[PDB]
Design an enzyme around this catalytic site. Structure first.
Site, short mmCIF file in Angstrom:
data_model
loop_
_atom_site.label_atom_id
_atom_site.label_comp_id
_atom_site.label_asym_id
_atom_site.label_seq_id
_atom_site.Cartn_x
_atom_site.Cartn_y
_atom_site.Cartn_z
N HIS A 209 3.09 7.50 -1.73
CA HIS A 209 2.56 6.66 -0.68
C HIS A 209 1.52 5.78 -1.31
O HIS A 209 0.45 6.26 -1.70
CB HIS A 209 1.95 7.52 0.43
CG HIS A 209 1.30 6.74 1.52
ND1 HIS A 209 1.98 6.27 2.62
CD2 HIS A 209 0.02 6.33 1.67
CE1 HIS A 209 1.16 5.59 3.39
NE2 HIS A 209 -0.05 5.62 2.85
N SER A 247 6.67 2.26 -3.57
CA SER A 247 5.29 2.46 -3.11
C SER A 247 4.28 1.59 -3.86
O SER A 247 3.26 1.22 -3.29
CB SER A 247 4.90 3.95 -3.23
OG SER A 247 5.54 4.74 -2.23
N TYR A 250 3.06 -1.57 -2.30
CA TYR A 250 2.05 -1.52 -1.21
C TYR A 250 0.66 -1.11 -1.68
O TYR A 250 -0.25 -0.96 -0.87
CB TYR A 250 2.50 -0.56 -0.11
CG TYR A 250 3.85 -0.92 0.42
CD1 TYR A 250 4.00 -1.68 1.57
CD2 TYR A 250 4.99 -0.52 -0.25
CE1 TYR A 250 5.25 -2.02 2.05
CE2 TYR A 250 6.23 -0.86 0.21
CZ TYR A 250 6.37 -1.61 1.35
OH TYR A 250 7.65 -1.92 1.78
N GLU A 339 13.19 4.75 2.32
CA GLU A 339 11.91 4.89 3.01
C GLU A 339 11.97 6.20 3.77
O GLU A 339 12.84 6.37 4.62
CB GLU A 339 11.62 3.72 3.95
CG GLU A 339 11.77 2.32 3.28
CD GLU A 339 11.08 1.17 4.03
OE1 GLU A 339 10.52 1.37 5.14
OE2 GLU A 339 11.09 0.05 3.48
N1 LIG Z 1 7.39 0.87 3.74
C1 LIG Z 1 7.15 1.83 2.86
C2 LIG Z 1 8.21 2.63 2.47
C3 LIG Z 1 7.99 3.64 1.55
C4 LIG Z 1 6.71 3.84 1.04
C5 LIG Z 1 5.66 3.04 1.45
C6 LIG Z 1 4.27 3.30 0.88
O1 LIG Z 1 3.30 2.99 1.64
O2 LIG Z 1 4.19 3.80 -0.27
C7 LIG Z 1 5.86 2.03 2.37
#
Ligand SMILES: Nc1cccc(C(=O)O)c1
Length: 357
Positions: A209, A247, A250, A339
């Site tokens: 994450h 991940s 993000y 995801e």
């Molecule tokens: N949208 C999405 C999918 C998988 C992981 C993450 C993350 O925040 O690491 C986000």
């Protein structure tokens, strides 16, 4: 009359971490990166009331878009009210009207980060106790103590270290690969008891994450959360990935000296019985009635034949160790990478924090 500041109990790597995640500069940076006008909206003026007003302004906008053309206020006037309550800077030009779902969610996501910045600020308020005690902790010890969350730096011969490292390397990007600096084992307490309530639930996996640096102190304090305006391609829960490279997309880091520093969690996720989708569904608020999780299945998946396990508080937790391989059955999925979604906060437990360059 002059209070003694006690020596710091923290090792170098942990000091730097705690400095980074409470850094005023990092917070302001995050605000400027989200087009927020830090001059009109400074860290110490940031308030729960104001963020609350922002969300309502957004709510009014969502009704406007997702409604029909009754006699209501235009998107222009409603955007303008939002920009009064949450001041933005766009080089002193008129900000753009929030006039699509994409833009609406982008502004919700911003207000969710800002809320977590306000959380950090609130957490740092000095109690009256603290004015009365005649010795104070080193400021970094105080800030670590405020998290009410245990962090233990791992060295290279910790039992899980090579597992994590391999997870990182094999599922990270081939060329632009994140450089591992430190791993901390993470134990937020009282996270423990919600998680015990899923103990006969099997199918546990350690999942990535990524987040921006500005919410890391919030997560260490409160856990990963499903907030009221959160969302995304698989709806309203907590997003995780089996591919580090997904991940990493993000993670929002910050330039430090010659380096760009970023932080990444590994959560133990009790996925139980999985429901697989292959098309976006931003409206999901829970799995279908038999199921405990929703997996938006990717074109690829870390080679399950290379999966290993890790014993965490006596439970088997699967840690992928393989490079991504194609999954013929999901080759036409709308998702290049998987995801992983849970729709209740109790189903995940923070296990590790990574610093990566
Ligand atoms: N949208 C999405 C999918 C998988 C992981 C993450 C993350 O925040 O690491 C986000």
């Amino acid at each position: 009359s002059m209070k003694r500041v006690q020596p710091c109990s923290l090792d170098p790597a942990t000091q730097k971490l705690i400095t980074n995640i409470f850094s005023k500069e990092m917070f302001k940076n995050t605000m400027a990166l989200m087009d927020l006008d830090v001059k009109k909206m400074p860290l110490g003026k940031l308030s729960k009331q104001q963020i609350a007003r922002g969300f309502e302004a957004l709510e009014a906008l969502e009704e406007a878009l997702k409604g029909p053309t009754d006699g209501g206020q235009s998107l222009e006037e409603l955007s303008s009210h939002f920009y009064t309550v949450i001041p933005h800077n766009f080089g002193h030009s008129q900000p753009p009207p929030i006039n699509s779902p994409e833009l609406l969610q982008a502004k919700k996501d911003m207000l969710l980060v800002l809320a977590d910045i306000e959380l950090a600020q609130a957490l740092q308020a000095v109690s009256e106790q603290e004015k009365t005690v005649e010795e104070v902790p080193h400021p970094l010890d105080r800030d670590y103590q405020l998290l009410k969350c245990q962090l233990q730096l791992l060295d290279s011969g910790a039992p899980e270290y090579k597992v994590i490292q391999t997870y990182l390397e094999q599922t990270g990007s081939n060329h632009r690969c994140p450089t591992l600096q430190h791993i901390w084992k993470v134990n937020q307490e009282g996270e423990e008891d919600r998680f015990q309530a899923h103990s006969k639930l099997g199918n546990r996996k350690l999942l990535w994450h990524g987040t921006n640096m500005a919410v890391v102190a919030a997560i260490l304090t409160s856990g990963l959360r499903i907030m009221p305006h959160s969302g995304g391609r698989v709806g309203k829960g907590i997003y995780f990935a089996s591919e580090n490279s997904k991940s990493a997309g993000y993670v929002i880091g910050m330039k430090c000296g010659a380096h760009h520093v970023g932080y990444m969690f590994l959560g133990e996720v009790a996925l139980g019985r999985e429901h697989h989708i292959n098309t976006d569904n931003p409206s999901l608020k829970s799995p279908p009635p038999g199921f405990d999780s929703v997996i938006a299945r990717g074109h690829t998946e870390p080679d399950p034949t290379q999966d290993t396990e890790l014993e965490l508080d006596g439970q088997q937790v699967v840690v992928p160790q393989g490079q991504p391989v194609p999954c013929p059955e999901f080759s036409s999925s709308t998702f290049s990478q998987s995801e992983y979604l849970i729709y209740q906060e109790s189903q995940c437990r923070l296990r590790y924090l990574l610093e990566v360059h």
